[PDB]
Amino acid sequence: PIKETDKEVVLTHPADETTSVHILKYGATVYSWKLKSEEQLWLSTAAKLDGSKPVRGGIPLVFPVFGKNSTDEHLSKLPQHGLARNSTWEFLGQTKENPPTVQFGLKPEIANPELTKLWPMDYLLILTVELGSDYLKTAIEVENTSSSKELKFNWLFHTYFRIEDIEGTMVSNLAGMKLYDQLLKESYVDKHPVVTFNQETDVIYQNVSAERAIQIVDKGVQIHTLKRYNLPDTVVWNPWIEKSQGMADFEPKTGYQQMICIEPGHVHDFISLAPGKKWNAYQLLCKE
Ligand SMILES: O=P(O)(O)OC[C@H]1O[C@@H](O)[C@H](O)[C@@H](O)[C@@H]1O
């Protein structure tokens, strides 16, 4: 079933109503995904769900710029990670009962007014969210609705996976890939056979295809699998102690121990869309 309220849309799977996903209209932000009652995503207990600022947790949507830009006249005006996660999207309706599937839309006319004035480019976004019995698929389509101007953008899903304990966690299938380390400010190949975590981590992997599933492992158990289409980059991030402490909307302060962000995106360069052209991609979360 699919239920709409003033602030959100909630999907429950017909075969098992304890499998569910909650999507805030603000940012079209998935903030909970339960699989047979078990929460899959990390959400700060102090996250704002009231539209006052981006949600600290779940799956914030990053568009049209990942990070902070300092090279483009207009993109450099936007705050870190763009304006999609700061704007209230329109609920376009349900498209299927089983698996429950819904769509959300964004265009400048309904987006964050302040930020739209800073980056007055035309676009149409449609997010499709499909709740399977054992997966969550979040798909995006971007259309350049301008008749004359090229549309230049990044897209990323800022996925906060819930885990039991970060220091026991490893991430597989990234061995041998090139990354840019945003902390050390250098690029290098990951020569570790798995990724482990004992400090702040903020890295951007390049060249991951639809064929490479990334797995999150704890106690020899594969607790999450991330698949994607058309998102060649993967950001891996954990704020660790100090940064967690400095984020007012991040609670509990030990909460970095129960999350890892593994964020599929197109962020290494900008996508350029000619007038009337479209681009699409998705992230697919599951368990193998
Ligand atoms: O705090 P935000 O804007 O949600 O971004 C989360 C993190 O995003 C990363 O891309 C940045 O490198 C970090 O510095 C930042 O803390």
Residue 158 annotated to the active site:
yes
Long-range contacts of the stretch 64-71 (C-beta < 8 A, 24+): 64/119, 64/121, 64/123, 64/152, 64/153, 64/154, 64/155, 65/153, 65/154, 66/154, 66/156, 66/235, 66/265, 66/267, 67/182, 67/267
Q: If you measure from the C-alpha of residue 80 to the centroid of ligand 1, how many angstroms do you get, rounded to a whole number?
A: 7
Taking only Cα atoms into account, the Rg of the chain, rounded to an integer number of angstroms, comes to: 18
Phi, psi of 206 (to 5 degrees): -115, 155
Resolution in Å, one decimal place: 1.6
> How was this structure obtained?
X-ray
Residue 150 annotated to the active site:
no
Exposed, middle or buried by CB within 10 Å (0-12, 13-18, 19+), for 118?
middle
User: Taking the domains of the chain in order of start, what are their residue ranges?
Assistant: 1-288
User: Taking the CA of residue 222 as centre, how many other CA atoms within 13 Å lie in the half-sphere pointing to its CB?
Assistant: 11
Q: How far apart are the C-alpha atoms of 16 and 223, rounded to whole Å?
A: 20
The closest alpha carbon to 205, from 270, 280, 282, 268, belongs to: 268
Cβ atoms within 10 Å, residue 188 = 11
Q: How far apart are the C-alpha atoms of 175 and 178, rounded to whole Å?
A: 9
Determine if the peptide bond prior to 252 is cis (ω within 30°).
yes
Q: How far apart are the C-alpha atoms of 169 and 43, rounded to whole Å?
A: 18
Q: If you measure from the C-alpha of residue 86 to the centroid of ligand 1, how many angstroms do you get, rounded to a whole number?
A: 14
- 1-288 placed in CATH 3.40.1390.10: no
Mapping DSSP to helix (H, G, I), strand (E, B) and coil, where does residue 259 land? Answer: strand
Q: Which residue minimizes the CA distance to atom 16 of ligand 1?
A: 239
Q: How far apart are the C-alpha atoms of 136 and 233, rounded to whole Å?
A: 20
